[PDB]
């Protein structure tokens, strides 16, 4: 029967476009979770109750180690709430901020895990994530990746089936999307180039605060390759950021599999990635469940029919 009275509210872990995320404790079980809390009002106001249903449904039907589990969805009169498994090692944005750059081996580990989950989404849920960014990437207690946020997913995409909605994050949009062409799943692979490029290089491949200029870069210019990149790495990023989806790594019929075979991932054993038998190159050092050292402090520190019923929103897990 779940409501807000069933949890204690301990820490604000993050805030923004996505509503507010709070480290909560379930009263009846003592268990910790991240509760993402939206106001029903902003969601109608931005004509996007469809995103929330999409996210609800994508979370209920996914079980995968590198996607954050849902334990409850419940709504109130004024809010929608997604109680999800808590990722205790923090935001990867946090971590790459402190370190500037990841090692090849470390970027390889995370990227392996992202490919795993995205290959899952594509080939088992027929879902195209669409919004892969550093900011949507958490770490659990053992240092494994967790992808969160499914509002911008496309559902029911099979083979090369295509889509037209103009969405994502400006800095990550793939060329064929800027081009106002119909696009398919190879978007997700473009997004993965930008995240790998960020991890290994220390900056986005295309940057301007002016979008018109930012979009012209994405369309017009080749990536720069820092001289610290090994030849395998120059090759994976070059292939993942082919501007033509048809020429992109992961963009033929074999999808993720063209990326798993790439020499950058040589001697990564994919079933081992999946089964979590590879050592995370960084074990978060947390001192308890309530310890939020790896969450960013602007947040840790803080502490009608515009309000409709969302039908069959409410959910409680039981595999």
């Amino acid at each position: 029967r779940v409501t807000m009275n069933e949890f204690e509210y301990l820490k604000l872990l993050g805030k923004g476009t996505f509503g507010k995320v709070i480290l909560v404790k379930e009263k009846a079980t003592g268990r910790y979770y991240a509760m993402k809390i939206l106001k029903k009002e902003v969601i109608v106001a931005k004509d996007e109750v469809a995103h929330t249903l999409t996210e609800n449904r994508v979370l209920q039907n996914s079980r995968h180690p590198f996607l954050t589990a849902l334990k409850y969805s419940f709504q109130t009169h004024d809010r929608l709430c997604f109680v999800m498994e808590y990722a205790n090692g923090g935001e990867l944005f946090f971590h790459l901020s402190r370190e500037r750059v990841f090692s090849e081996d470390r970027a390889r580990f995370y990227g392996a895990e992202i490919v795993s989950a995205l290959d899952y989404l594509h080939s088992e849920k027929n879902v195209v994530y669409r919004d892969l960014k550093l900011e949507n990437l958490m770490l659990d207690k053992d240092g494994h990746i967790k992808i969160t946020d499914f509002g911008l997913c496309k559902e029911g995409i099979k083979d090369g089936a295509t889509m037209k909605t103009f969405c994502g994050t400006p800095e990550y949009l793939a060329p064929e999307v800027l081009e106002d062409n119909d696009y398919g799943r190879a978007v997700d692979w473009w997004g993965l180039g930008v995240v790998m490029y960020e991890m290994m290089c220390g900056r986005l491949p295309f940057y301007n605060q002016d979008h018109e200029k930012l979009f012209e870069l994405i369309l017009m210019e080749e990536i720069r390759f820092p001289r610290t990149l090994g030849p395998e790495a120059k090759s994976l990023l070059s292939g993942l950021l082919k501007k033509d989806p048809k020429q992109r790594l992961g963009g033929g019929s074999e999808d993720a599999k063209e990326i798993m075979q790439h020499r950058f991932f040589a001697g990564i054993v994919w079933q081992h990635v999946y089964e979590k038998k590879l050592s995370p190159p960084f074990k978060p050092q947390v001192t308890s469940e309530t310890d939020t050292r790896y969450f960013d402090e602007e947040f840790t520190a803080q502490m009608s029919e515009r309000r409709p019923h969302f039908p069959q929103f409410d959910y409680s897990a039981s595999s």
Binding site: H51, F166, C167, T169
Partner: peptide
């Protein structure tokens, strides 16, 4: 220190 980006949907 890189600023956070923002997702959007037209």
């Amino acid at each position: 220190g890189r600023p956070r980006t923002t997702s959007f949907a037209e």
